[PDB]
Every structure is written in C-alpha cells, then in structure tokens.
Write an enzyme that holds these catalytic residues in place. Structure first.
Site, PDB file in Angstrom:
ATOM      1  N   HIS B 345      37.726  30.888  -4.999  1.00 35.00           N
ATOM      2  CA  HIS B 345      36.251  30.968  -4.887  1.00 35.00           C
ATOM      3  C   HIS B 345      35.617  32.183  -5.581  1.00 35.00           C
ATOM      4  O   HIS B 345      34.389  32.277  -5.570  1.00 35.00           O
ATOM      5  CB  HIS B 345      35.838  30.994  -3.427  1.00 35.00           C
ATOM      6  CG  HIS B 345      36.357  29.845  -2.645  1.00 35.00           C
ATOM      7  ND1 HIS B 345      35.569  28.781  -2.266  1.00 35.00           N
ATOM      8  CD2 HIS B 345      37.583  29.603  -2.144  1.00 35.00           C
ATOM      9  CE1 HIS B 345      36.294  27.919  -1.581  1.00 35.00           C
ATOM     10  NE2 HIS B 345      37.524  28.385  -1.502  1.00 35.00           N
ATOM     11  N   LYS B 536      20.563  33.983   2.465  1.00 33.82           N
ATOM     12  CA  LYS B 536      21.963  34.240   2.162  1.00 33.82           C
ATOM     13  C   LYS B 536      22.343  35.669   2.583  1.00 33.82           C
ATOM     14  O   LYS B 536      21.490  36.440   2.990  1.00 33.82           O
ATOM     15  CB  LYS B 536      22.240  34.056   0.671  1.00 33.82           C
ATOM     16  CG  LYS B 536      21.273  34.732  -0.288  1.00 33.82           C
ATOM     17  CD  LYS B 536      21.626  34.302  -1.701  1.00 33.82           C
ATOM     18  CE  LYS B 536      21.197  32.882  -2.050  1.00 33.82           C
ATOM     19  NZ  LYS B 536      21.741  32.565  -3.398  1.00 33.82           N
ATOM     20  N   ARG B 537      23.628  35.978   2.481  1.00 40.31           N
ATOM     21  CA  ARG B 537      24.197  37.311   2.682  1.00 40.31           C
ATOM     22  C   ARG B 537      23.323  38.370   2.035  1.00 40.31           C
ATOM     23  O   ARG B 537      22.991  38.243   0.836  1.00 40.31           O
ATOM     24  CB  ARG B 537      25.584  37.413   2.007  1.00 40.31           C
ATOM     25  CG  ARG B 537      26.762  37.435   2.936  1.00 40.31           C
ATOM     26  CD  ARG B 537      27.943  38.179   2.304  1.00 40.31           C
ATOM     27  NE  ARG B 537      28.312  37.726   0.950  1.00 40.31           N
ATOM     28  CZ  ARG B 537      29.205  38.344   0.164  1.00 40.31           C
ATOM     29  NH1 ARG B 537      29.852  39.421   0.608  1.00 40.31           N
ATOM     30  NH2 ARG B 537      29.484  37.867  -1.039  1.00 40.31           N
ATOM     31  N   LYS B 542      22.963  39.605  -4.796  1.00 41.79           N
ATOM     32  CA  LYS B 542      22.149  38.438  -4.435  1.00 41.79           C
ATOM     33  C   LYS B 542      20.686  38.701  -4.717  1.00 41.79           C
ATOM     34  O   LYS B 542      19.923  37.758  -4.857  1.00 41.79           O
ATOM     35  CB  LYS B 542      22.401  37.995  -2.976  1.00 41.79           C
ATOM     36  CG  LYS B 542      23.895  37.960  -2.639  1.00 41.79           C
ATOM     37  CD  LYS B 542      24.399  36.729  -1.923  1.00 41.79           C
ATOM     38  CE  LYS B 542      24.921  35.723  -2.914  1.00 41.79           C
ATOM     39  NZ  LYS B 542      26.084  34.988  -2.366  1.00 41.79           N
ATOM     40  N   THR B 644      26.344  26.757  -2.125  1.00 45.45           N
ATOM     41  CA  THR B 644      26.125  25.451  -1.533  1.00 45.45           C
ATOM     42  C   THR B 644      24.730  25.377  -0.896  1.00 45.45           C
ATOM     43  O   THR B 644      24.225  24.285  -0.609  1.00 45.45           O
ATOM     44  CB  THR B 644      27.290  25.095  -0.571  1.00 45.45           C
ATOM     45  OG1 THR B 644      27.449  26.102   0.429  1.00 45.45           O
ATOM     46  CG2 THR B 644      28.637  24.965  -1.352  1.00 45.45           C
ATOM     47  N   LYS B 648      21.609  22.402  -0.702  1.00 37.95           N
ATOM     48  CA  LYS B 648      20.897  22.000   0.516  1.00 37.95           C
ATOM     49  C   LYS B 648      19.403  21.927   0.298  1.00 37.95           C
ATOM     50  O   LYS B 648      18.785  20.947   0.702  1.00 37.95           O
ATOM     51  CB  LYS B 648      21.256  22.879   1.707  1.00 37.95           C
ATOM     52  CG  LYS B 648      22.721  22.726   2.030  1.00 37.95           C
ATOM     53  CD  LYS B 648      23.080  23.803   3.043  1.00 37.95           C
ATOM     54  CE  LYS B 648      24.573  23.991   3.101  1.00 37.95           C
ATOM     55  NZ  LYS B 648      24.848  25.120   3.970  1.00 37.95           N
TER      56      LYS B 648
HETATM   57  C1  LIG Z   1      25.204  26.339   3.274  1.00 35.98           C
HETATM   58  C2  LIG Z   1      25.209  27.655   3.992  1.00 35.98           C
HETATM   59  C3  LIG Z   1      25.681  28.939   3.331  1.00 35.98           C
HETATM   60  C4  LIG Z   1      26.144  29.028   1.887  1.00 35.98           C
HETATM   61  O1  LIG Z   1      25.100  29.717   1.123  1.00 35.98           O
HETATM   62  P1  LIG Z   1      25.391  30.327  -0.351  1.00 35.98           P
HETATM   63  O2  LIG Z   1      24.626  31.585  -0.594  1.00 35.98           O
HETATM   64  O3  LIG Z   1      24.993  29.149  -1.208  1.00 35.98           O
HETATM   65  O4  LIG Z   1      26.875  30.675  -0.388  1.00 35.98           O
HETATM   66  C5  LIG Z   1      25.668  30.136   4.052  1.00 35.98           C
HETATM   67  N1  LIG Z   1      25.270  30.164   5.349  1.00 35.98           N
HETATM   68  C6  LIG Z   1      24.828  29.085   6.009  1.00 35.98           C
HETATM   69  C7  LIG Z   1      24.384  29.217   7.426  1.00 35.98           C
HETATM   70  C8  LIG Z   1      24.766  27.747   5.360  1.00 35.98           C
HETATM   71  O5  LIG Z   1      24.354  26.635   6.034  1.00 35.98           O
END
Ligand SMILES: *Cc1c(COP(=O)(O)O)cnc(C)c1O
Ligand SMILES: *Cc1c(COP(=O)(O)O)cnc(C)c1O
Lengths: 807, 807
Positions: B345, B536-537, B542, B644, B648
C-alpha cells in the site's frame, strides 16, 4: 407429552442460536449447556414475575450475607423444582444422549467450603420454598477453594477452574456495579465526615436464580466479582497500577486465601461484600415504587450475619446512613440494631474473629472511628447500669488490649444486632452463658436458638428418589414441604412390606455407588458388606484417627482368626485437609496407607475394604449419603456446635455412631437415644478427665488391641518404605492429644460391636432405620427458616404468593 | 407482514430470556441488544449452513490477514443484507421505540484505524457477496485506537471502551484456543529443530458473521484476544508472573500502540496474529472430511498479506511445515510461495517495515534461523543468474547493514509470495519498477495491480438509500452486485426529471446532516450553502493547511467587499492526528481557531461556516459523505497510492477537487478529467520543482491574498490570547514544507473559483454529478475481489452456492 417435545425443540434451538453449533461439532459440555439454557428459560418467567411482585407489593426483604454458598450442581435441582425431570430424561434420551452423563459434566459451584456454606445454600432453598422475599449476597469466587487430588496417598491441591467454560445459570449485571473504597484518610468538615483519597475497587454483580419448590417463587443469589477501574504515569506508577489491578481482582479469586498479610486480603474480602451489599440494599430501599424516609428501613430490611465475616455491616450501615444519607447518629443506630441480626456457629471465645486496629487504621480509617464511637456509647451504658465495675468494662469492650490493640468483631455483632442465635439448643446456651455472658446479663431477650436444618429437596428428593417414592406411596407428597409428616411412618415398623422396601432402596443405592467406586478407585467392593461412612473436614477434633484405629483393630482380628465369621465392611473416609495443616495431611496419608495394606491382603479378601473418598464436595455427598448404612459422627464431646451431615445420613436411612454432642443430641432426643449408637465421654466427662489429667500412655499400656494397632503405625507396618511417616501422629496421640482419642477407643470398639450385632439381623437393622427417618422431620431447613422468619425477621411465610408467569 | 410480528416476538423473547429484563427496567442499550440478537438469529441459520457447505464441498479457502478491520456498526448492514430493514423499522415503531435511536447506541467496532482497515472490511463484504470461502483473521483490540475529543480547540485522546457493555455480534470460541510461543531458545536435535523454554500466550478466538448480499453465504471474521495461561513462587517470581500476564493481555489492548520498546509490542502483535492464524489454517486443512498430505495445501489454501504486518506468515508456515509436520524444506518452500500473496500500500522504499535482528534474536530465535536460510538460498539463486554482481546481492538481501543489522519484512514478503500487488495502476508500476526493481527484473509475472474498491452496500445502499432508490427506479436492482451497470445512467444527463431527482436526494441528505450539525456543534448551518468536505488523517502530506489558507482567503474576501454576491460554503474538515504528531495537532487547532473567528463574525453571517468534524470514524463517514457537494482530495502529487474516500464521494453525488495522484487519476480516466476539478503540480512537476529547489518565500512575497492569510496566522489574528500558537506551522510553510503548500495555492484558488462558478448553475452542477456516479462502477470492491480471485487466488466467484438454511 407436549413437554418432551418442547425440551427437545428448546435444546436444539439453544444448540443452534445460543451455542452456534450443530451436532457434528458439539461436545458433551455443549450438550450440558444447551440443556442448562433450556431449563433456565423455565425459571426466567417466574424470576421476572417474582421481582415484579416484590416491587409492587413492597414486602420486607431478607438479606442473607455469607462469605460461603456451597451450592453444588444446579441442573438436577432446577429440573425437579419445575417438575421437568421426567420430560428432560425422555427428551435427552430421544436426542441420543444420557441425562446423568450430562449431569456429571456440570461443575460443583466453587462458592462454598464446608458446613457454613451448605447451611447458606439450604437456607436459600427454604426461603424460596416458603415464599420469603430473600436475597443471598456473597463473593463470586473465580477459583473456588481447591479440588483435592490424592497423589501417592497424599493430598494435592489442584485449582478449581469451575468458571473456565462459563456458568449457564448466572446473569452478569455490569450496569448494577458499585464502588468499594479502601485506604484513604478521613476529614471532619462542617458538611459532615468525608472519606478522601481512597483506592476504589468495583463490585460487579452476577445474579443466580433460587427456585422455590412447587410454588412460583424464584429468588436471587447476588454474587460480586472484584474488578479494577480502568484509565500520566512514570515507570513506577505503571507497576503500582498493574499490582493494584491484580490485588483488586484477587479479592474474588479464592475462598479463605492464605498468601503473611493475606490476612489483609481476608479483611478486604469481608469489606468488599459488606460495602457492595449495603449500597445495593439501600439503593433498592429508596428506589421502591413511591419513595426521615429511613424510619421505615427496619420494617422493610433484615440483614442476617452468617458469622462475624460480614460484621462490618454494622459500622458500614452507620456510615452510609450518617455520612451519605444525613440521618442523625442516634436514629441511624436504633435503625442499625433493628435491621441487623447475628448467627454464631462456634464454641469457646478464642475461635471468634479479631483484627488488629493498626490494620483498620490503614485500610478503613472511617469504620475505625465509627467502631470507637459505637464502643464508647456502649460502655457508658454499661457504666450506668453497673457503676465502678472496671473489669466488666474491659470484658464487654469491642477493643481488646495485648501485644497490639485488636477489634473483637463478635462483640461488635452482639452490640449492633437486635437478635443473636446459636445453631443447636445446647450450643445456644453456651453462646448465652459463656461466650457472651456479660451481654446476656444485660439483654437476655436478644439471645435465641435456631437449630440448624437441611433441605428436603436436595438431601432427599434429589439424592434419593428411591426412598422418596417409597415414602410418597405410604404418606403422600405433603412431607416434602412439611417434613414433620414423616412421623406417620412410625407405625410402619411392624409392616413387613415397608421394611423390605426400605432395605431394597438402600441396596439399590449401595449398588449404584459400588459401580462408581469400582470404576474410579479399582477395589473389589462386596455388595453384602456394611457401608461405614465418615465424611467431613480432616481435623484432629473430628477424630478420623479414632476410626483408623478401629479399622486396624478389625484388620488384626481377621488376621488372628481368618476362619471366624466377620460382618463385612466397606469403610469410607473422606474430606479435605487445610493446606497448611501438617497433622491433617498425615491423617489422609494414614487412611490411604491402611487401605493399601487392608485391600491387597489375600487373607482379608472381601471382609474389609478401606477407601479414601477423593474430593468430598456437595455432588459427591449426594452419591455417598444415600448409600450409607453407618454414619460416623465421632468428634470429641464439647467440640461440635451442630453439624448438618449428621442430619443428611438420618434422612437417607443410615444409623448413627456418635458422641453426645452437637446435632447428635437433638437427633437422639427426637428418635430416642436407643435408636442411635451413642458412646464415649460426655461433655462433663471430658471436663472431669481434664481435672484428673489425661495420660494417654495408661490407655496404650493396658489395652492390647490398641497397643498392637499403634505399634504397627509407629514401626512402619502401614508404611514399609518410609517407616517413620506417622511418627508425628503417634507422638501426638501419646503426649499432645487434646481430643482424647485413646480415652474413647474402648467405648468406641464396644459400640461398634453393638453395630455389628445389629447389622447381623437385617430386619431389626431396618426397623431402627425407619425409627430414625420418621423422627428426622425437625431437621428440615423449612422449620429453621420459619423459626428465623417469625422470631427474628418479623415476616410470615406464604404471606407473598407469586402467581403463574407470562411468556 | 408476518415478518413484523416475528421481529416483535423475537425482540421481547430476547429482552426476557437473553437480557433477563422487562420494559420497566430496560435501557435503550438493552433495546439495541434485544434487537441485535433478534437480527443475529437470522444470520446463524445461514452461518451454520455455510460452514457445513464448505466442509462437505472442501473449496479452496481464502485467508485475509490484517492488523486492522474498520468494520463500523453492524446492525444496519445486517438488516439490509437480510432484507429485514423495513420489517424492523415497523416492529420497533410498534414497540414504542425508534430504530435510528437504537442504531446510534451501537459502538463503532474498535478494530480498524484508517484506509487499510476499511479496505479489509469492504473486501470481507465482497468475498461473502461473491460466494468465496473467505475468512478474515485479525486481533480483537479491546480498546480500539482512541475516540477523538476536541477540548478548547485541541485534540484529546479518550479511551475507546467499545466492549464495555459487550458485542452482540461475536461468539467466543474458548474451545478453539491456540498457544503462541515467545522467547525461548532453539536446539538442533536428530529428531529435528526444537524451540524450547518459550513463554506462552494463549490466543482466544471470537467469531463474527460476515453476510453476503442477497445470497445465502455468511462468512467468518475470526479475531484473537490475548490471554495469559494460569497456574511454587518467591516474591520476585510472583511479580514476574503478574507483569507477563499484563504484557500478554496488552497484545490485544490497542491498535498501533506507542508505549520505547513498545516497538517490541508491535512485533509481538504481528507474531500473535500470524501464529494463531497459521495454526488454525493448518488444523482446518488436516481436519477436512476425509484427510505427503501437504502437497494439496496450495490448492486448498490462499493466505493474503495485507501489508508487511503479517509478513511472519512466510517463516512461520515454513516452521510448522518443517519442524512440526516433518515436510522436507524444499517442498515446504514451494508450498509456502504458492500459498502466500502480498499486497503493498506504500510508495518509496523507506516507508517499508524493518525490525532489528537483535529483537528477533531474543523474541523469535527459530524464525530468525528460518529467515537466514530463506535469504541465503535466495541470494545463491541471484548469484547464479547474475554472477559477480556484488551490489545486486546487497540490494536484494532481506537483511540490511547499518547502525545495526535489520530485517526488511517487505523483501521477505516478495521472496515468499507467488504474487505481489499494488493498489492502483500507477502505484503498482512504482511497486514493480522502483520499490522492488531488482525483484521485478528476476520475476516480472509475480507483480500485478489490484485497483482498490469500496462496497456498494455500505457506501451506497446503507448510507444513501435516497440515491439508491432514484437509481433503482431507472435501471433496476442489478447494479448493487454489478456496479458497472451505473453506466446506463449516462444518457439521463439530458433527463430534466432525473436531474431534479438527484438534486432533491442531495438536499434531503444535506438537511439531515444539518440537523446533526446544529444539535452537536451549535453553529447556524445555511441550507443553500455548498458542503465542502475534507475528511482524512490529519497529516502535512494530506494538506488540510492548503484548505485552511483557502478558507482564510475567502474570509478576507467577504471582509473587503461585504456587499458582494458570494457562493455560500459550509467547510467541514475532519480526521484524527497521531498522538505524538506535534504538527498535526497544531493543524487541528488552526481549523478550530479559524472556525471561531469565521463562524462568530457578524459581517460574514450565513456566507461561510467552518467546522472541525470531531471523531471521524466509519459511522460518521456514512452521515457526511452522502451530504457532500465537494470532496477535497488535495494531497501533494506523488504521495498517494490509491485512496478509497475519493471513491465514496464519487458514488454519493459529490464532485472532486484534487491533484493528479492516487485514485483521482483512475477516477478522471473513468469519468473524463473535465468532470473533475483537477489542479496543481503533477507528479513530474513536483520532481521538476525539487530540481529547481522550492523557495516558499517567493510565493508568500508575490501572492498578496496568501501573504495576508499567512500574516494573520503568524501575528495571532486567529489566536488573540496566544499569538505565537501557530509559529511552527508558519516556520514549516516557509522553510521545511516538503509538501509544497504555497506552490499549489494559486492553482488551488483558481480551481476553487471554477467550482464556485459551477455551483452557481445548479443544473450543470448536477449534470456533472450524474456523469461521476455513472462512471464510478469500476470502484466496487466486487470488481477488485473478482480480480484477486481470478488472477491471484485461483478461485471462481459463485462456484459455491449456499442453499437456503434449516431452523
Ligand atoms: C473510506 C474511509 C477511509 C479511507 O480514506 P482515504 O484518505 O481515502 O485513505 C478512512 N476512514 C474512514 C472512516 C473511511 O470510511
Ligand atoms: C452437609 C455437608 C457438610 C457439613 O458437614 P458437617 O461435618 O456436619 O459440618 C460439609 N460438606 C458437604 C459437602 C455437605 O454436603
């Protein structure tokens, strides 16, 4: 039956939906669980309805506090109190399984240890059968006490992992958890006394159903598990936390731990049940449907203290009422005395529980303050009634002086209770006149007697259905809830049909227990031999050694004249020795060493067999008691308060060889002493021998059969490879024997000969048996509990009538 | 419906018989449990039948090994995959309760953390929907990672006590427990290699059902809890035991622990899942109906390594096969390579997992030996194919030299796997050509691509039923299992009715999320404003800061000309910061500090609102994603492998503002780049800026709107009481910004203006949305999993057809 089909459907439903298994992957344990769930569902309907009924009708609640609940196995009791035994037997058969096999997979609840614990369990069954609003409170011990194993003829303690696979009967109530406080310091502020900087252990409740016999009542046993609260830290703070977590959780680890500040752990255990329980009792009281307000508390709450273990109930009730509920000290005290009652189980004042005050200074500083205040007010009263009596003040004080100040917990129980009872008529007289003499002079009315009892369901209907049916055929089913109805059996001593029926039941029981014996111990059991049973705690005062000497004497007698006609005996000795009790472990070794010689001697053959029954528990008592011909109850006179094993043998068709002490006295008085094999020194004779001075040497010297037996034990005849194995046994019997084993040997031998002559006549043996059974009705725990209810709790049995439930 | 009546009857049955409660004492949590049990019963029938079916038909089994399973909440997914949503809604209503209220009482499973964990959960749902014989294996983390709380605008980590009240979905299997060995020493004997004097931790399995969508398959997620074996001891031995007990149990305490030999705890966690799982896989293999014998193992078993965390699977499979199963080394190795496959990954080789060899010497001495043997045989092969190439040997070796010898776990995964895949087309090219360049030269066929995906059930049917119905009306239900069928929506960009329908759904979703927002955060939300979402994180790469600068620029623009017509925005930024990440915690504080100024400025009013979404989890993603107009996917080009979250937003009707990296690339390629708001530096441009050298000062100096924004942040305009709060943010953006925030600001601003001009035209906005949704079908985890199944596992979907169960 539609019942057999319902159990079958419920078993499979539990197997699939609860266990998440099928018949290919399921073990016998899964099958036991599936059945246990099926059966528990029948209780739940009544359990919910019972608690809805007590909430609606707000009856006075009975709280039985004990550090022991010797419950045994639950599946059979539950099936019989719901009438589903026959339906389950058939359903399990149709499923391709065996009910009795499944019954054997269940663990004996590791919640009790001995007499005190079994008494609690019998009481709970009676309180439910009588329709009382009764709650048992105790500790959920994760590892019981220990499972006894015999390895190379000695006792080994194995851990009782009884919760390993889970308990199907109990329900966890993590939502009803309460905090328990330890350590800290106390501060007197204008807003009242505050207990600060305390360590907190959480008390997590687990509820177990206690079903009433052929009524709709299902009461609750509420058992607390110790858990540490979770969460900054340095290296040391982290280790402190991990240790405090472990010390918290070992509060509910084992019964009667040893560890030598494992005494501090006992005190912690005592407070943990007290604080958990009292907070729960109060919460229930103020959460009543429609609820200054504490004035009705003694009318809605009775707290029964089973020994001094829950003694802290007195200053803790005082603490919650005064420091939390803001009740006035005097009012709270009059409330305390009226809610609490104390049951004593011991003789002589030195057995009574004491704690050093220094230990209280550290662990419970607020309770120490309260105890000091209770004591001062109590001694002011004594000083008013008896002015200038300085020694009376010292005797009556809860705090004793010595190598350190100590708190006499028994004195605290007497002062903080409205009633104080002993467990047999003469023991209760000793409790009054000797143990608490000064307290009796001040308040005679406080002191009572509540002769112990056993439950007729477990100790008859469950363990001996054969005898139960033979009695049911002749006098109907009503005796099972009114055991004094067994007196109607008295005229049947003439009935030739009844006599041969009672004897047939005994022999059926003997044969079933022989099958367990031959399979497990690998000794050839003689079916026509007399089952001689001595099952209790291995202790010098209980005198298993006296029984050992008899067995050796009999071995020697068969060896002298092997052609002679001898009454065949299977001698069974069972019981657990306290792990640190050197003499008791020597005694277990003596029994197995004797058995090794006796059972493998070809000259002896099928005349005499000696077995040490490994791991005497509730479930094993239920196998052996119904199969016994003779019950050994041979403790030195003056040592036993009551005894309940005595009662179990009497109800199941065994004759009793015993001394005139404890339960044996009231058993003699009920059935007539001629129907019992009473022998040896009387209480007064024991005292008179202490005035003369006991010289055991004189007995050994002038009793040849005894000299031969002791010499064999001493010389290593029973221990060829280690001939000095029993040196400490012999040394004790000759120089330090406080229990007068030699002094009672001759009387015991003569008495056993009278037993031998009666067994030689089957009909007159069984006639005496019928006389015992017919006069045992008094020893029902229903009788005991009705007594407690009317003379102590101020509740009437069957005043609460739970109606059929709704599903 | 008879269904509504059955759920009602099952709920009450669970409330009485399972919970042992009535409606007077029951809490909403008890009601959630009662319902959760009712619903689980519908799975059990299929779950049993599925496992009976795999045992009978012995299919090839897929084992997905991950240290993360970001499962979220289960009640809704379970109800929808069984078709019982409508029946439960009605039954719960008739019972006097609210289904959505009960849904909110359920805890987010603390089993995952981010992308890697959610990927695992989407995969498990797909594997079950496709009818694969798939098992998820991981750790049952008792306390998750942490629940984020915002206190005084900063992140606080609160413990995730998600198992406090129990998990109704899981079944404990204490009977299927396995030992895990640690430490010890290794001895070469004539009977084979022996690993002796090991500490043992027990792995206790808990099974959770994984239901297939509108098929009868219910698979298993098997999660292991660490438990110490119970029991002689001195004072020190006792403390050693208590600590080892605690260190055992903290293996399954929290995800990604910190503790600095909390790295040793990570290694222990990694081995704990590997050893537990591999013993279980083997036990299942040899316990097959009707079972030298290991030659069929690669045909009955696939082990998928989700990252290098389960890398120890290679030498542990080698260990069990050779030391326990007595299989020949070479044979065991060819078996190993064919059973194992590895998914990477990450981008760039320095992110790849390494462990010091000294740590392995102590914790796993036998695995170290095996690793050394695997490496030597691997380098002999390389030496044969490329003779004398000394640097190739050093690059390709699993053991690296430096300040200490280290084991490159990624190299071990490449060597011990038959297949190696990246998670997006270009990332997989980087995996091949850069990360494992030398391995690709030797075996190109090993290397593959498996573009990530999301489950259409959770990320459409569950979180957005409104949009799901509007699509169902036009193209039927088949797209829910074949998402590429959404391309039939392409002609509907002309349909005026469809456009106003898709817009109506979005606004319904926006209104429902506004209601959650106003209730929880207490900010007035404008309903006509554009929902700008960046979840996200929290990390520098980011670039939440890039989004922060845009927001400040907009605030300043409204302040300069307050009369001007401005497109209203609700800017939502969410995500968790790593507890020790100073910059990321500063960033969270910046967002809340900006919001405090923006949201309380009366000149600004309903034009701009900034909210930090507290505790971004799976369940919250399902609320916010369906309500989003704009998706910020703004990481520096070259940093993201896939993503991912991107997917969404695309499926739920949001347009994407992003860079040309990760998932955005394949999303552009699927829908046409003109339908996405692509901006900023391209991967090659980033490289070209590193050749020039990035001088962020030049950007700050010659971009006035940026200079004003940075000066406000620096001078304390957003932090009046502590004006140097963001000093490290500013210092980083000017001197150490590796993620080129300033370099992309102008391009980002211009791109946001194009977003503003499109939102100004509702119809053309929603037309572009329909084009996105219609081209998202590729990003279904069904597609990804079918790909893994055919190109890696050698299994065909729907070759196993589970028939309707029996109750
Ligand atoms: C889908 C999802 C992620 C993945 O987010 P990316 O920044 O695209 O890696 C992270 N956390 C939650 C809660 C999600 O549903
Ligand atoms: C009844 C019973 C006892 C009590 O025996 P005593 O010696 O009479 O105190 C002890 N243990 C068990 C298992 C019992 O069933």
């Amino acid at each position: 039956l539609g019942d057999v089909a319902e159990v079958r459907k419920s078993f499979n439903r539990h197997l699939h939906f609860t266990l998440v298994k099928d018949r290919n992957v399921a073990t016998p344990r899964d099958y036991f669980f599936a059945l246990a769930h099926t059966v528990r569902d029948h209780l739940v309907g009544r359990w919910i309805r019972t608690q809805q009924h007590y909430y609606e009708r707000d009856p006075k609640r009975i709280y039985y506090l004990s550090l022991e609940f010797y419950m045994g196995r639950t599946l059979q009791n539950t099936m019989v109190n719901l009438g589903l035994q026959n339906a389950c037997d058939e359903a399990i058969y149709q499923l391709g399984l065996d009910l009795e096999e499944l019954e054997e997979i269940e663990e004996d609840a590791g919640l009790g240890n001995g007499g005190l614990g079994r008494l609690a369990a019998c009481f709970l069954d009676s309180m439910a059968t009588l329709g009382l609003a009764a709650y048992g409170y105790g500790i959920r011990y994760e590892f019981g006490i220990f499972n006894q194993k015999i390895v190379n003829g000695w006792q080994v303690e194995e851990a009782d992992d009884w919760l390993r696979y889970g308990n199907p009967w109990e329900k966890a109530r993590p939502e009803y958890m309460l905090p328990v406080h330890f350590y800290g310091r106390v501060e007197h502020t204008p807003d009242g006394v505050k207990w600060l900087d305390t360590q907190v252990v959480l008390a997590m409740p687990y509820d177990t159903p206690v079903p009433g016999y052929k009524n709709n009542t299902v009461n609750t046993m509420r058992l607390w598990s110790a858990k540490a609260p979770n969460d900054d830290f340095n290296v040391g703070d982290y280790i402190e936390a991990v240790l405090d977590r472990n010390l918290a959780e070992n509060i509910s680890r084992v019964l009667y731990p040893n560890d030598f500040e494992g005494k501090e752990l006992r005190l912690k255990q005592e407070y943990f049940v007290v604080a958990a329980t009292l907070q729960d009792i109060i919460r229930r009281f103020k959460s009543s449907k429609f609820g200054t307000c504490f004035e009705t508390f003694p009318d809605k709450v009775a707290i029964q203290l089973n020994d001094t273990h829950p003694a802290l109930s007195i200053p803790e009730l005082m603490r919650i009422l005064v420091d939390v509920e803001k009740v006035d000290w005097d009012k709270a005290w009059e409330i305390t005395k009226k809610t609490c009652a104390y049951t004593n189980h011991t003789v002589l004042p030195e057995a009574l529980e004491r704690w050093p005050v220094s230990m209280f200074e550290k662990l419970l500083p607020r309770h120490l303050e309260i105890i000091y205040a209770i004591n001062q007010r109590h001694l002011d009263h004594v000083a008013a009634l008896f002015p200038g009596d300085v020694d009376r003040l010292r005797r009556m004080s809860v705090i004793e002086e010595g190598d350190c100040k100590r708190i006499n917990m028994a004195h605290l129980c007497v002062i903080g209770s409205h009633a104080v009872n002993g467990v047999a008529r003469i023991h209760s007289e000793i409790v009054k006149q000797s143990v608490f003499k000064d307290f009796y002079e001040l308040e005679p009315e406080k002191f009572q007697n509540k002769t112990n009892g056993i439950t007729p369901r477990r100790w008859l209907l469950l363990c001996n259905p054969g005898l139960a049916d033979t009695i049911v055929e002749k006098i109907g089913e009503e005796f099972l809830t009114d055991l004094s109805q067994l007196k109607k059996l008295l005229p049947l001593v003439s009935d030739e049909v009844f006599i041969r029926d009672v004897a047939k039941v005994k022999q059926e029981n003997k044969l079933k227990f022989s099958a367990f014996l031959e399979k497990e111990y690998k000794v050839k059991i003689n079916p026509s031999s007399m089952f001689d049973v001595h099952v209790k705690r291995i202790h010098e005062y209980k005198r298993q050694l006296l029984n050992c000497l008899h067995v050796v004497t009999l071995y020697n007698r068969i060896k002298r004249d092997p052609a002679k006609a001898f009454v065949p005996r299977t001698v069974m000795i069972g019981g657990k020795a306290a792990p640190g009790y050197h003499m008791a472990k020597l005694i277990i070794k003596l029994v197995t060493s004797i058995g090794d010689v006796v059972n493998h001697d070809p000259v002896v053959g099928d005349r005499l067999k000696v077995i040490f029954l490994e791991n005497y528990r509730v479930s094993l008592a239920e196998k052996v008691i119904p199969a016994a011909d003779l019950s050994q109850q041979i403790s030195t006179a003056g040592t036993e308060a009551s005894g309940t094993g005595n009662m179990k043998f009497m109800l199941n068709g065994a004759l009793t060889i015993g001394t005139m002490d404890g339960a044996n006295v009231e058993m003699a008085e009920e059935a007539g002493a001629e129907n019992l094999f009473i022998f040896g020194l009387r209480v007064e004779d024991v005292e008179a021998l202490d005035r003369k001075g006991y010289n055991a040497r004189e007995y050994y010297d002038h009793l040849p059969e005894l000299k031969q037996a002791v010499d064999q034990i001493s010389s290593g005849f029973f221990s060829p490879k280690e001939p000095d194995c029993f040196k400490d046994i012999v040394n004790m019997l000759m120089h330090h024997d406080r229990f007068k084993v030699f002094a009672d040997y001759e009387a015991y031998m003569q008495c056993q000969a009278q037993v031998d002559q009666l067994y030689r006549n089957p009909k007159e043996w069984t006639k005496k048996v019928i006389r015992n059974i017919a006069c045992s009705g008094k020893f029902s725990s229903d009788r005991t509990i009705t007594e407690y209810a009317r003379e102590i709790w101020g509740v009437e049995p069957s005043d609460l009538q739970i109606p059929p439930p709704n599903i």
